[PDB]
Every structure is written in structure tokens, then in C-alpha cells.
From a paper:
Repair of Iron Center proteins (RIC) form a family of di-iron proteins that are widely spread in the microbial world. RICs contain a binuclear nonheme iron site in a four-helix bundle fold, two basic features of hemerythrin-like proteins. YtfE has an L-shaped two-domain architecture: it exhibits an N-terminal ScdA_N domain connected through a highly flexible penta-peptide to the C-terminal four-helix bundle hemerythrin-like domain containing the di-iron site. Altogether the data so far gathered for YtfE such as the induction by NO stress, the interaction of YtfE with Dps and proteins of the iron-sulfur biogenesis system, the iron donor properties of YtfE, and the ability of YtfE to promote the formation of an iron-sulfur center in IscU and ferredoxin, all indicate that YtfE is a bacterial iron donor.
We also provide a new structure of the Escherichia coli YtfE in which the iron binuclear center is replaced by manganese ions and discuss its impact on the overall structure. For this purpose, wild type YtfE was incubated with Mn2+ ions during the crystallization process and X-ray diffraction data were collected. Analysis of the anomalous difference maps obtained from data collected above the Mn and Fe K-absorption edges shows that the metal site contains in both positions a mixture of iron and manganese ions: in position 2, which is closer to E159, manganese represented ca. 45% of the metal occupation, while position 1 retained almost all the iron, as only ca. 10% of manganese was present. Therefore, iron in position 2 is more easily displaced by manganese than that in position 1. This observation is consistent with the Mössbauer data showing that in YtfE one of the iron atoms is more labile. Hence it was of relevance to determine the affinity of the wild type YtfE to manganese and compare it with that of iron. This study was done by analyzing the quenching of the intrinsic fluorescence intensity of YtfE upon the addition of Mn2+ or Fe2+, and determination of the binding constants for each metal. Moreover, the binding affinity constants of the wild type and mutated protein are significantly higher for iron than for manganese (ka = 6.5 ± 0.3 × 10−6 M (Fe2+) and 0.5 ± 0.2 × 10−6 M (Mn2+)).
Author numbering:
A (entry chain B): 5 to 220
B (entry chain A): 2 to 220
The structure:
């Protein structure tokens, strides 16, 4: 089988399939499609059949072979800037939901705290990438960046841990029947954030970082 | 159609239907009044397949139908089959969880907090069963079950708290699924935990869905 990261970046809409299977293609892009079943000891034939047909048409944009400088500029505008705009909004929405629906049992109590931890750590994380690691790659020094890259990958792991908690506090971002408009819309935004953040980390761990280290 | 019957009645009439609902995480014990239809819709599950699985299991009658048994025999059965077993099994699980949380402290999948939650369950369950054995079960055996709305509602409320802890224990243990690196002690403990959950849900089911309502109805 091929690596998770290789398939997610080469087959359109394979990203969401892996996310709903609890398959870590971002920080666990190391993982091959085979061992992914080991976690759940579940069918691989279905996943290969789905993937084979999902690949009817080429990918909208193959970043695997794109210049590293363009990958960087793409990450800044498509993921970093979006994260900075979304998380302050989600924090406020979670505040409103945890107060307005405090008396209900299905309310995701603690979501604001966990979203806030993610915002603080992700902001610092992205500031470090944009001010230290990305410039160093643009100057052609990626081959000497094991240290900084390993620090970012460690922080990627931390963020993934927080994502798992957030997914638990919200029953895998599934609104209960009591969900109002604010509540449902917040969960939609939360799913959007998780989708973007896994594709974001995936692109970094599975393309930008290894290619930089290899001297591209 | 089975989908229109209450969970509790299905569990009490179809052999091993209890295990099918535990596989689907359907609460037939404290939520046995809930119909299979509403329970399956709540979890976005194909109810027609569940009905086929039930019809298969229902090819065979229940080995022992407690729904029509004398209340005194239900009580004596509960005490020996569930209460006495819970008392022997929780102390063993507490010590095993202690050994596992120490020995495998350095591993990621270790069920941190399992000993605390097992202990809370044991404490609340112990006092719960004593209050049943000393207060509620005697009054039902005396023919006063129709005057036991109060005590039964207190027992049912405590059944709900117990279910809350069971849900905590299940999350701490990845739904009682050992990781690949699980040793023998770790695997055997999770087996015991599943046995406890199985028994306690059949235990609570028998009380909420048979003993309590029939006692209140004057049987
Ligand atoms: Mn980044
Ligand atoms: Mn990053
Ligand atoms: Mn009891
Ligand atoms: Mn009881
Ligand atoms: O990032
Ligand atoms: O019980």
C-alpha cells in the first residue's frame, strides 16, 4: 500500500474519507494505508475501492512537486490566515453556547477552554513558522533544518491531541437534537477548522518538510 | 416490527439481544422504555439490519423469562447473580487497574484514571445494593410494592449515576478495547470490565424493566 499522505494529496476528496475513519493522514502521514486498518482491524477493500473511483479525475492542484516557496505562500494565505480568522469566532460562539445552553446536558462544556488553548498554541506555532522556518527554507537552507522541523512536528502532535479532545467534547462534532442555529453553525465551523488544520499539517509534514530536508 | 417495541422488552424476550444492544451502545437498562426505532435513529443506525439480527436471535426462545416470575424469586436471583458477583469482582478490578496504571504508566494508551472511576463505582454500588437489600427488597416481599414510588425513584436515579460512571469507564478504556501492546494482565482486566458492564446492565435492566414497574403495579 501507499502512504496515507501520498494518497490524500493524490486523490481528490480522500481527505474527508480518512477524517471520518479516524485515520491520521496529517501528522501520521508516515502511516501506510495498510496499517490504518490495524487501529480498527477493519476493511481495506472498501477503502481501496472508494479511492480507486475517487481518483476518476486528477487532483485540482498537485502540491507534491510544486516549488517550496509557492507551497509556503499557499499555506500562509490558505491556512494560517484562515485559522487566525476562524478561531476567535469559534471561541466567542462556544462562549455563547456554553452559557445559553448551560442547563442542557448535551452542551459541550469545556469547548471554549480547549478552543482557546488551540488558538494560543497555534498562533505561536504559526508565528514561529512564518518568522524562522519558512524564511530559512526560502533561502535554500532547508537541508540544515532538522532541529526546527522536529520542533514544529512536535507541536503538530500537540495540536492533534487537542483536536481529539475537542472532537470528544462535541461527540465528534455531531450536534444533538437540541442544537439551535448558533450551535449547529459552530459545529459546522469546527469541522471546517479540523478539515483545514489536518490538510494544513498534512501538506507540511508530508511535502514541505521532507522535501526541504532532502534539498529541493 | 421490532423497531416499535421498547428496548427493555426486546432484551428480556430475545436471547443475547442484550449483547447486540451493548454492541450498538444502546442503553436497554436505564433507557429500556425507549423504542428500538428512537434509539436507532438517535445513533444514525440502519434499524432494518438490527431487526434482522434480532429475528435471527429470536429464532430461539429466552432461556429464562423473568418478566412473569415471582418478584421474590427475581429478588433472590438478583442478590446471588448480580449483587454478590459485583462485590467479588469490583475489588479485583480495582487492584488490577492499580497494577496496570503503575506498570504501564509510561505507555500512551494506559487507562489513566481507571482505578479512581472503578473505586467511585464500587462505593456508590455498594451503598446502593445495601439500600436495596435492607429497605426496598423487603418492602416488596411484604406486598407493599404499590407504596414504593419514592424508594424506587431513588434507586432509579442512582441507576442513572451508575450509568454515567460506566460511560466514563468506557471512554477511559477506548470502549474497553486493549491496545496492541496490551499484556496479559491488561487484557484480562478489560475482559473483567466488560463482564462487569454486561452484568450491571442486565442487572439494572431486570430492576428498571421488570421488578420496579411490576412492584408498583401491585404484583
Ligand atoms: Mn503552518
Ligand atoms: Mn505547522
Ligand atoms: Mn440491585
Ligand atoms: Mn439497583
Ligand atoms: O502550521
Ligand atoms: O442494583
Amino acid at each position: 500500500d501507499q502512504p496515507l499522505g501520498e494518497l490524500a494529496l493524490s486523490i481528490p476528496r480522500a481527505s474527508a474519507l480518512f477524517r471520518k475513519y479516524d485515520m491520521d493522514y496529517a501528522a501520521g502521514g508516515k502511516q501506510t494505508l495498510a496499517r490504518a486498518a490495524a487501529r480498527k482491524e477493519l476493511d481495506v477493500e472498501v477503502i481501496e475501492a472508494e479511492l480507486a473511483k475517487l481518483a476518476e479525475q486528477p487532483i485540482e492542484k498537485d502540491w507534491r512537486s510544486a516549488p517550496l516557496a509557492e507551497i509556503i505562500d499557499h499555506i500562509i494565505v490558505r491556512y494560517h490566515d484562515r485559522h487566525r480568522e476562524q478561531l476567535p469566532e469559534l471561541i466567542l460562539q462556544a462562549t455563547k453556547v456554553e452559557r445559553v445552553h448551560a442547563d442542557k446536558p448535551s452542551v459541550p462544556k469545556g469547548l471554549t477552554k480547549y478552543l482557546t488553548m488551540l488558538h494560543e498554541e497555534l498562533s505561536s506555532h504559526m508565528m514561529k513558522e512564518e518568522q524562522i522556518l519558512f524564511p530559512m527554507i526560502k533561502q535554500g537552507m532547508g537541508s540544515q533544518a532538522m532541529g526546527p522541523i522536529s520542533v514544529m512536528e512536535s507541536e503538530h502532535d500537540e495540536a492533534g491531541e487537542l483536536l481529539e479532545v475537542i472532537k470528544h467534547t462535541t461527540n465528534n462534532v455531531t450536534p444533538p437534537p437540541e442544537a439551535c442555529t448558533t450551535w449547529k453553525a459552530m459545529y459546522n465551523g469546527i469541522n471546517e477548522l479540523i478539515d483545514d488544520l489536518m490538510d494544513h499539517i498534512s501538506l507540511e509534514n508530508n511535502v514541505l518538510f521532507p522535501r526541504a530536508l532532502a534539498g529541493e
